[PDB]
Design a binder for this molecule. Sequence first.
Ligand SMILES: Cc1cc2nc3c(=O)[nH]c(=O)nc-3n(C[C@H](O)[C@H](O)[C@H](O)COP(=O)(O)OP(=O)(O)OC[C@H]3O[C@@H](n4cnc5c(N)ncnc54)[C@H](O)[C@@H]3O)c2cc1C
Ligand SMILES: CC(C)C(=O)C(=O)O
Ligand SMILES: [Mn+2]
Length: 455
Amino acid sequence: LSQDFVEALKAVVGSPHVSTASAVREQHGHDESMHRCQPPDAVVWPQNVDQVSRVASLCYNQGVPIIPFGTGTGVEGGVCAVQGGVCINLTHMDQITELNTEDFSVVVEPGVTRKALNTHLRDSGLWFPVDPGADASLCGMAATGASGTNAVRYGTMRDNVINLEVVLPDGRLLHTAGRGRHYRKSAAGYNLTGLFVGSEGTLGIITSTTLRLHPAPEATVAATCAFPSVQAAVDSTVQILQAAVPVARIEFLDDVMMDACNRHSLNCPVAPTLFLEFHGSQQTLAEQLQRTEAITQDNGGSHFSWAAEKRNELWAARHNAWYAALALSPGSKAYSTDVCVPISRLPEILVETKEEIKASKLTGAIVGHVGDGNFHCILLVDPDDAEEQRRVKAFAENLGRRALALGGTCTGEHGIGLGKRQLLQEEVGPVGVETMRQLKNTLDPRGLMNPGKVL
Ligand SMILES: Cc1cc2nc3c(=O)[nH]c(=O)nc-3n(C[C@H](O)[C@H](O)[C@H](O)COP(=O)(O)OP(=O)(O)OC[C@H]3O[C@@H](n4cnc5c(N)ncnc54)[C@H](O)[C@@H]3O)c2cc1C
Ligand SMILES: CC(C)C(=O)C(=O)O
Ligand SMILES: [Mn+2]
């Protein structure tokens, strides 16, 4: 970047909020994935939406790529500056506004995390349910289309994003559903909000998200259930879903994952395990518990090991499964798969994935949101063993392709980033790809909005 351009950036956001220092750029050139760090040419922290617009306009008209950056917890290299450019760290815009408890809605800026929002909402009787394991920006969660353990009951970001404020690549300000609007449903025009959820910073910069809030559950009960086999745990999961038990959380861990979590946090039996949580009244909980225990017993599940103090450490361990897996081989990095299949095909593909991990030399732990037909294989890689990273690539792709063969998707929540671009082309085919590209081209004609990602 030229010095004239850097001074132009400083004129918008202020000297302290522009950095070309190598260390600062390197810290903003990677996320939590194994994708190689690719430092931006500068990092910029805009202080308000007017500054975001003016930084975007400056970059766009100068031919400088723009990389939106939230909390950097992505796992597909979304923030990697594969063509250099300006990294826009959005987290100094950190205010919660328009809290409408009577309407179950709130507006958050990119610096607001889920933990910050729910702390703000303590004693309101309301909460925000979508719970990635990481302390992630809620606008980043909108950008990636995130879900979490609670999604099986309370929905994904796509279900819970009501409106988005977006700075388009050339600086124009769009409110996808209209400025200040919030409602339960609409047929007015084309739904622009859903286009920008899961766009990963390639269609514009999300500067606020309007979120659906939910009432806190009347009562909660959590438990773990150990099984003799992966087959038994996943069969139980499918049968719980087909019996329409409204479980709040149903999380799978294989024996490797359970052992890793034990060592990193817990003392559960080392076995394929379900972490379960139920919401309702006492009578409603007792009914759900009886029907769920009946199904798990049919498949050899243990009596439920019951679990606020215990409950929080249970889900804290689950939320840290990524780091528990990494701790199995200190110094390694990791790649997560994220396929999601029709639920009736979930037993085949998890059992097959377990057998393929056993039969390979790779270290993999299995965990995830099986209530959605979704799961993660966390594959460890030595950053210096290029042959191991080739085998982890080949394994991840082969699993992705098996998911596509079963009518599923290559990613349930993490997104495409740099890692799944070929799988996406296979998933939606030539007309799907061209349509997606035409949408990208109308919003970002010069191709400067986070280039090299998704498409
Ligand atoms: C331990 C751990 C557990 C995780 N668990 C989950 C999980 O359960 N579910 C899940 O879905 N993900 C999970 N993730 C992945 C990650 O937390 C989510 O993808 C999260 O939504 C990323 O948000 P971020 O702001 O940190 O993203 P970043 O890494 O900052 O960015 C991600 C992508 O979105 C773009 N982007 C970010 N902010 C904006 C914005 N405001 N406007 C436009 N584009 C933007 C970036 O350019 C990039 O392409 C986990 C990650 C870790 C490390
Ligand atoms: C494995 C990580 C990336 C995750 O998404 C989760 O904890 O569910
Ligand atoms: Mn997940």
